[PDB]
RNA sequence: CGAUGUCGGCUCAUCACAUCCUGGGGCUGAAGUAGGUCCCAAGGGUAUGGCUGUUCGCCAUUUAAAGUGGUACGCGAGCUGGGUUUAGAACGUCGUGAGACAGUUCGGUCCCUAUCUGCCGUGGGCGCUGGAGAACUGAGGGGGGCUGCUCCUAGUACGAGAGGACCGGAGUGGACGCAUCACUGGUGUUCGGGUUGUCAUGCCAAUGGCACUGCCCGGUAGCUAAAUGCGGAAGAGAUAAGUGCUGAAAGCAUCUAAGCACGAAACUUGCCCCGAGAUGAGUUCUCCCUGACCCUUUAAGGGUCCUGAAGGAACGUUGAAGACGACGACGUUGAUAGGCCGGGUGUGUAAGCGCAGCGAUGCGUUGAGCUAACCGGUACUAAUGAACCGUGAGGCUUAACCU
RNA sequence: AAUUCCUUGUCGGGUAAGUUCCGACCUGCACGAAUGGCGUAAUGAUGGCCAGGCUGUCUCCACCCGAGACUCAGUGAAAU
RNA sequence: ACACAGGUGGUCAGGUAGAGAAUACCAAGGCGCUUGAGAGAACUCGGGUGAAGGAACUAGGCAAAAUGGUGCCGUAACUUC
RNA sequence: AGGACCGAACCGACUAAUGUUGAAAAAUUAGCGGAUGACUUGUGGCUGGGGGUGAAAGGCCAAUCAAACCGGGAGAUAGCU
């Protein structure tokens, strides 16, 4: 389960296999993130040609999960990798152009259809 | 941190009273003989609640 | 008291198709996701048994490119559309764990065809 | 509105189309024999007694018995008491069911929660265990430091340490009634409820106006 | 602890209380009623009425069986041929427990295990 | 000074109130939202990451706060032992020098047969009085207590506007706390199967033991959290600060003196659990018993025989009840524990026989064979008559009724 | 700096930050050529700082096995 | 001090497996104990099992687990070659 | 060939754990390590009190040691207890 001190491949269209989970969030005492809900993370390599620098503090999202989407029935939807999209910290909305993620029926449950809709996977 | 000064030995008494064992009267007999046993077990004549369970 | 089994049979389905582990089960399903139904397909093989009564999970997975892609669908649930299965395993076990961390020729599965 | 009893059958998920999966527990209802009814000088109040099962004829004692004479002596799982006000109508001549609950919604359960009576620090007091490795001598489970040095002389009333736990009376509120059968004597609630599966729950109406 | 375990863990280890089982096994068949301790009586009826029960058939595929941990040479024309009529025969109750009383000078509690019919 | 462990690190308390946050609101250079400041209040609350012996400090991100103090600036018959504060080493300095040093680092122990006061579960007496049994009172104690996010009222009040609130009206979260095992994971040394080394049943097959449960691969029942369900209520009573009515001392005036009314996250209930040793030893219902004789002599005391109710105890079979005790189920007026029978879950198609293929191996008979906990069926094994304890209407009185 | 208070000097690098690490510098209150000077590899029961696998050290433990805690009998202590 | 988990000189080491004196089943050979019965809780000691995460723990990967055999391939800096 | 790489017998102290009124006058369990040497070892000797021995800690010198142990001067002396 993903938490402090966490490296993450990124769901962001040119970023690298490697971005730290530096806070969990929710202001209260947390253990482990949950999906489709915020983590703080620091780029720990950047490619040229993306749009993030390294050692940079950024806002995230959590939108895929070894633990899998699983609340209505129990029936579990599960990935093979765990992986976060990046957020604007005042602007708002996913930075990227591209998602790669299997943009989950929590992720339309924000303010964010309009820019992970190109391939619906589930 | 040691014993100081002895307990009282009616304390000691008291401690003591807490005793169960019992004078085990009266003891049970045989439906077929006045032979004595604790209620769950054989007499060490072979009788028992009167069936006869081993033989001479 | 068994009133709790037929509690369960009440939402089971009269009629279920049979597969086994490791069979091609090639499946369709109309979703619902509590709002809008709509048509769905997902191919691979049944990695798990069905198998007690209602709570029977009936566990799907796609393994491809080098990932497994696991799926709970349930075997009695409400959305289903069809299951066609079209092909035989050739396995011996049941729980099939050594399939998730296998790729290609070493996460094969075969035909049996026999 | 007084009160019923009925054995804890199981639990089981019953789904929902938008979420969640909801377990649902199954309450097994008992002809609830109304063996008496407390009036007569009785502290100006006026209180029912149940019965859960007819036990043995061969076991009875004749205080029991002559008490029980008067509805014919059964006695059996657990006798129970509760308290009848604002009920209208006199319960004696018919055996209370489910018809209890045939208009109420919502109830509270008394489970009586499953022993685990030998207890500990890690399994009642919810504490950590300190430093398998590093170093550390004989306090691996403790709930630290039990009380402050010197001036205090003595040790403080209501600690967290010691006692036992399960077989509270531990009830639950954020109950709901799924189905009621008047006729197979059998109740539905939403939820999970203290006590193991085969064990026998007390349940009573709630209302509010 | 122990919570659907009923199994008894007695005393000392799970190995000696196999080899002991399993040898007392060859010692009731043998005299018929045996004398030991209350608790020892108990556990020798644990997996001994299964193995009674397999001395029942005597088809050529089950003689392959009763013989992986209780060998005696005066037992094998008996197998397969009595323990059925005499003992498996009855479908399960194959033993009866009786306390005798105490153990010689000390508090231990003694009882004898025999076969449910004796022979003619 | 015949010997109070010191700094920091971990783990964990109790009391204050000089209030950081939480409830209340006053004054203001207070329109409104705020800021600045004031005091009623300690019931609930008051992070995390890097550097150092480390407090002290600094930095990054979180917060309703990142409060202060007492308790040897709380917790070594507590955990840790890097600094300081052991033997040895090694650098800088002063001195003729042993030494010395407002100069400094490397390696450096942390003991404990728990008596008494205390604390936390649990037996056994004495007691309410003739004996037993079933159950329930409530004098009193404990538990509980704060809070994040969002939406409606409402873009309402105030104000061109900018900006933007009380008041009550709901939903949803975390630490944290509780419960169940139903889902999802885990474990599961009474179990199914593969396999390397080897021994054993003559040998081969088939099959079992050992080699860490040999190596495992797995797992029912169970338990468990990392799983799921739920949680700190609504209401009532009474107050403080504070706001007031009516009003005399002060013919005015005045929250007070007489007499009336309201009010805070506090206080007390309600909630939840205990609870008559509440010796201030509560209360109802049901069950049972209708015997004589002797002595000193007496409304006191002692002895003898006769043979005993209600009920308990004893004994199993054993438990969802346990360290010992205490407690549950029932005991042939029998399903209390087990075996056996029909089946589940879980393993994986074996053996025996033949066939294809130099062969490994695969194929058919075969969804084979195997079973414990789960489900149902069954007296097949086991579970004393009842001994023993318990006896005979139970002392005085105030008041009424029945006789 | 095995030599340096204020000092974590002052600057650069690594890092979300870094009294630690790496590299420079001179203004060494007091290094200096046998009371030796300076540098180099395998190497070191050597010390500081990072990366990866692997992992119950830790989130957080949860359940087992073999031995003690319990109990009864036999033989039955010590410090105080 | 003891019929005490200790100390202690010389000679010997087969089969099957294996490089082997490692190591197991074994061989020839030996012993089944100078307290026994039972049980089983918080806790004490070691071993076994390990999901998802992983060095976050800690002064420190200490401790623990993983790696592990040898025939054929393929190999940096630095260097007293 | 080897003050050589790993490694039985052989040796042995570094970490960790158990033990610590013990089995124990220093062991036990697991691991890392020493093993042709500046080594180790069977057997018997030789080195003594300010003397020995020490690739040298004032460590070791039969548990003792900024000076061992026993027996004597010695019932030494104590403005003190």
Redesign the pocket.
Same mark, same amino acid.
């Given at each position: 389960?993903?938490?402090? &001190?966490?490296?993450?491949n990124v769901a962001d269209n040119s970023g690298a296999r490697?971005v730290?989970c530096? !806070?969990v969030?929710?202001?209260? $005492?947390? %253990?482990?993130a949950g999906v489709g809900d915020i983590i703080?993370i620091?780029?720990?390599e950047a490619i040229p040609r993306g749009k993030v620098k390294?050692?940079?503090?950024l !806002?995230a999202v959590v939108v895929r999960?070894?633990?899998g989407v699983? @609340?209505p029935?129990?029936?579990?939807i599960r990935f093979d990798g765990?992986a976060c999209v990046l957020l604007n910290?005042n602007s708002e909305q996913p930075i990227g152009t591209r998602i790669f993620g299997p943009v989950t029926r929590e992720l339309r449950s924000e303010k964010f259809m309009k820019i992970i809709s190109l391939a619906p996977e589930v | 941190?040691?014993?100081?000064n002895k307990?009282t030995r009616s304390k000691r008494g008291?401690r003591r009273?807490?005793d169960?064992? +019992?004078a085990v009267?009266?003891?049970?007999?045989?439906?077929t003989s006045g032979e004595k046993?604790?209620? $769950?077990?054989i007499t060490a004549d072979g009788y028992y609640?009167?069936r006869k369970v081993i033989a001479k | =008291?068994?009133i709790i089994?037929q509690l369960?049979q009440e939402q089971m389905k009269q009629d279920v198709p049979?597969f086994?582990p490791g069979d091609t089960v090639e499946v369709k399903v109309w979703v619902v996701e509590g709002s809008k139904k709509r048509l769905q397909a997902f191919e691979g093989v049944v990695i798990a048994?069905?198998?007690?009564?209602?709570?029977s999970?009936f566990?799907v997975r796609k393994i491809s490119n080098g990932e497994g892609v696991?799926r709970?669908f &349930?075997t009695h649930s409400p959305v289903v559309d069809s299951i066609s299965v079209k092909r035989r395993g050739?396995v011996?076990?049941?729980?099939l764990?050594?399939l998730?961390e296998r790729t290609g020729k070493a996460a094969r599965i075969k035909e049996?065809l026999? | 509105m007084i009160g019923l009893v009925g054995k804890?059958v199981?639990?089981?998920?019953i789904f929902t189309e938008d979420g969640?999966?909801?377990?649902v527990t199954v309450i097994e209802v008992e002809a609830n024999r109304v063996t008496?009814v407390?009036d007569?000088?009785?502290?100006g109040?006026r #209180?029912i007694?149940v019965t859960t099962?007819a036990?043995?004829?061969?076991?009875?004692?004749?205080?029991?018995?002559?008490?029980?004479?008067?509805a014919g002596v059964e *006695?059996?799982?657990g006798?129970?008491?509760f308290?009848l006000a604002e009920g209208e109508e006199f319960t004696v001549g018919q055996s209370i069911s489910v018809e209890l609950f045939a208009d109420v919604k919502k109830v509270?359960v008394?489970? +009586?929660?499953?022993?685990?009576?030998?207890?500990? +620090?890690? !399994?009642?007091?919810?504490?950590?265990?300190?430093?398998?490795?590093?170093?550390? =001598?004989?306090?691996?489970?403790?709930?630290?430091?039990?009380?402050?040095?010197?001036?205090?002389?003595?040790?403080?009333?209501?600690?967290?340490?010691?006692?036992?736990?399960? /077989?509270? %009376?531990?009830?639950? &509120?954020?109950?709901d009634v799924v189905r009621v059968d008047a006729e197979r004597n059998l109740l539905l609630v !939403?939820?999970?409820?203290?006590? #193991?599966?085969?064990?026998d729950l007390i349940v009573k109406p709630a209302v509010?106006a | 602890?122990?919570?659907?375990?009923?199994?008894?863990?007695? /005393?000392? /280890?799970?190995?000696?209380? &196999?080899?002991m089982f399993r040898n007392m096994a060859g010692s009731l068949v043998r005299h018929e009623i045996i004398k030991?301790?209350?608790?020892?009586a108990?556990e020798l009826? %644990?997996?001994v009425?299964?193995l009674?029960?397999?001395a029942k058939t005597d088809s050529? *595929?089950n003689r @392959?069986?009763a013989? *992986? @941990?209780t060998?005696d040479n005066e037992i094998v024309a008996k197998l397969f041929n009595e323990l059925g009529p005499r003992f498996?025969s009855?479908?399960?109750?194959?033993?009866?427990?009786?306390?005798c009383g105490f153990?010689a000078?000390?508090?231990?509690?003694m009882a004898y295990i025999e076969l449910?019919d004796r022979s003619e």
């Amino acid at each position: 389960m993903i938490q402090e &001190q966490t490296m993450l491949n990124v769901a962001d269209n040119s970023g690298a296999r490697r971005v730290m989970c530096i !806070k969990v969030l929710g202001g209260s $005492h947390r %253990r482990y993130a949950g999906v489709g809900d915020i983590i703080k993370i620091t780029i720990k390599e950047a490619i040229p040609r993306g749009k993030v620098k390294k050692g940079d503090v950024l !806002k995230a999202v959590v939108v895929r999960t070894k633990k899998g989407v699983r @609340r209505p029935d129990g029936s579990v939807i599960r990935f093979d990798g765990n992986a976060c999209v990046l957020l604007n910290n005042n602007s708002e909305q996913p930075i990227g152009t591209r998602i790669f993620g299997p943009v989950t029926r929590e992720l339309r449950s924000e303010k964010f259809m309009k820019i992970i809709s190109l391939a619906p996977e589930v | 941190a040691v014993q100081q000064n002895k307990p009282t030995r009616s304390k000691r008494g008291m401690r003591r009273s807490h005793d169960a064992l +019992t004078a085990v009267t009266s003891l049970s007999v045989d439906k077929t003989s006045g032979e004595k046993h604790l209620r $769950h077990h054989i007499t060490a004549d072979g009788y028992y609640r009167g069936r006869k369970v081993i033989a001479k | =008291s068994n009133i709790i089994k037929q509690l369960e049979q009440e939402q089971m389905k009269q009629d279920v198709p049979s597969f086994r582990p490791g069979d091609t089960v090639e499946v369709k399903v109309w979703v619902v996701e509590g709002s809008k139904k709509r048509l769905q397909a997902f191919e691979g093989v049944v990695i798990a048994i069905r198998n007690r009564g209602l709570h029977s999970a009936f566990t799907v997975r796609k393994i491809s490119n080098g990932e497994g892609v696991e799926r709970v669908f &349930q075997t009695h649930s409400p959305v289903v559309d069809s299951i066609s299965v079209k092909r035989r395993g050739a396995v011996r076990k049941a729980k099939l764990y050594y399939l998730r961390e296998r790729t290609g020729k070493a996460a094969r599965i075969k035909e049996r065809l026999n | 509105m007084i009160g019923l009893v009925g054995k804890k059958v199981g639990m089981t998920r019953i789904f929902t189309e938008d979420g969640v999966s909801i377990p649902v527990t199954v309450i097994e209802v008992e002809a609830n024999r109304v063996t008496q009814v407390k009036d007569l000088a009785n502290d100006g109040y006026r #209180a029912i007694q149940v019965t859960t099962g007819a036990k043995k004829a061969n076991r009875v004692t004749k205080p029991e018995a002559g008490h029980f004479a008067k509805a014919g002596v059964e *006695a059996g799982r657990g006798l129970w008491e509760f308290r009848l006000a604002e009920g209208e109508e006199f319960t004696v001549g018919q055996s209370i069911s489910v018809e209890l609950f045939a208009d109420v919604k919502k109830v509270d359960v008394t489970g +009586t929660s499953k022993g685990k009576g030998f207890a500990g +620090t890690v !399994k009642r007091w919810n504490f950590r265990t300190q430093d398998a490795t590093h170093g550390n =001598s004989l306090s691996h489970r403790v709930p630290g430091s039990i009380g402050q040095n010197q001036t205090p002389g003595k040790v403080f009333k209501g600690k967290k340490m010691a006692g036992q736990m399960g /077989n509270e %009376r531990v009830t639950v &509120q954020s109950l709901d009634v799924v189905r009621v059968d008047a006729e197979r004597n059998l109740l539905l609630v !939403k939820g999970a409820v203290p006590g #193991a599966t085969g064990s026998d729950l007390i349940v009573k109406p709630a209302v509010k106006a | 602890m122990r919570h659907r375990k009923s199994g008894r863990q007695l /005393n000392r /280890n799970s190995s000696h209380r &196999q080899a002991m089982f399993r040898n007392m096994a060859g010692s009731l068949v043998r005299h018929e009623i045996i004398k030991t301790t209350l608790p020892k009586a108990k556990e020798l009826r %644990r997996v001994v009425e299964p193995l009674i029960t397999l001395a029942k058939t005597d088809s050529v *595929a089950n003689r @392959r069986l009763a013989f *992986a @941990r209780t060998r005696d040479n005066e037992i094998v024309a008996k197998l397969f041929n009595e323990l059925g009529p005499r003992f498996a025969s009855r479908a399960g109750g194959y033993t009866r427990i009786l306390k005798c009383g105490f153990r010689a000078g000390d508090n231990a509690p003694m009882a004898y295990i025999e076969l449910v019919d004796r022979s003619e």
